Curated annotation (Swiss-Prot), chain A:
The lineage of its organism: Eukaryota, Metazoa, Chordata, Craniata, Vertebrata. The chain holds residues 2454 to 2508 of 2701 of the full protein. The C-terminal inhibitory domain is phosphorylated. Phosphorylation relieves autoinhibition of the kinetochore motor. Sumoylated with SUMO2 and SUMO3. The sumoylation mediates the association to the kinetochore. It comes from the Eukaryota. It comes from Homo sapiens. Monomer. Interacts with CENPF. Interacts with BUB1B. Interacts with SEPT7. Interacts with KIF18A. Interacts with PRC1. Interacts with NUF2; this interaction determines kinetochore localization. Interacts with SKAP; this interaction greatly favors SKAP binding to microtubules. Interacts with TRAPPC12. Interacts with CTCF. It is linked to Microcephaly 13, primary, autosomal recessive: A form of microcephaly, a disease defined as a head circumference more than 3 standard deviations below the age-related mean. Brain weight is markedly reduced and the cerebral cortex is disproportionately small. Belongs to the TRAFAC class myosin-kinesin ATPase superfamily. Kinesin family. It is found in: Chromosome, Centromere, Kinetochore; Cytoplasm, Cytoskeleton, Spindle; Chromosome, Centromere. This is Centromere-associated protein E. Microtubule plus-end-directed kinetochore motor which plays an important role in chromosome congression, microtubule-kinetochore conjugation and spindle assembly checkpoint activation. Drives chromosome congression (alignment of chromosomes at the spindle equator resulting in the formation of the metaphase plate) by mediating the lateral sliding of polar chromosomes along spindle microtubules towards the spindle equator and by aiding the establishment and maintenance of connections between kinetochores and spindle microtubules. The protein is composed of a N-terminal kinesin-motor domain involved in the chromosome movements, a long coil-coiled region involved in the homodimerization and an inhibitory C-tail involved in autoinhibition of the N-terminal catalytic part.
Length: 55, 54
């Protein structure tokens, strides 16, 4: 019965580490994808200023 | 012992999901970070061209 208790605490720990990692993953995918969109706009601004400087 | 068996299985199942999630994260993050780094290089090179043009 002591083992059941230890196993259940280990189950609680491993699930919490699973949740923590999944939330960090989600956070970093979102921030990195937002950077991709931010730099897509920077690139658009660079093309527009370059067109006008050339014309 | 039956409950012990269920717990040990559940421990194995969760550690397996942890590894699976980790691998899928690392796959996607590396692809996206690659796009980010190519974008940064495009940006540097376009900025040079713009400074030249002006």
């Amino acid at each position: 019965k002591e083992e059941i208790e230890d196993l259940k605490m280990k189950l609680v720990k491993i699930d919490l580490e699973k949740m923590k990692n999944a939330k960090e993953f989600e956070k970093e995918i979102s921030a990195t994808k937002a950077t991709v969109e931010y730099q897509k706009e920077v690139i658009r601004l660079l093309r527009e200023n370059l067109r006008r400087s050339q014309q």
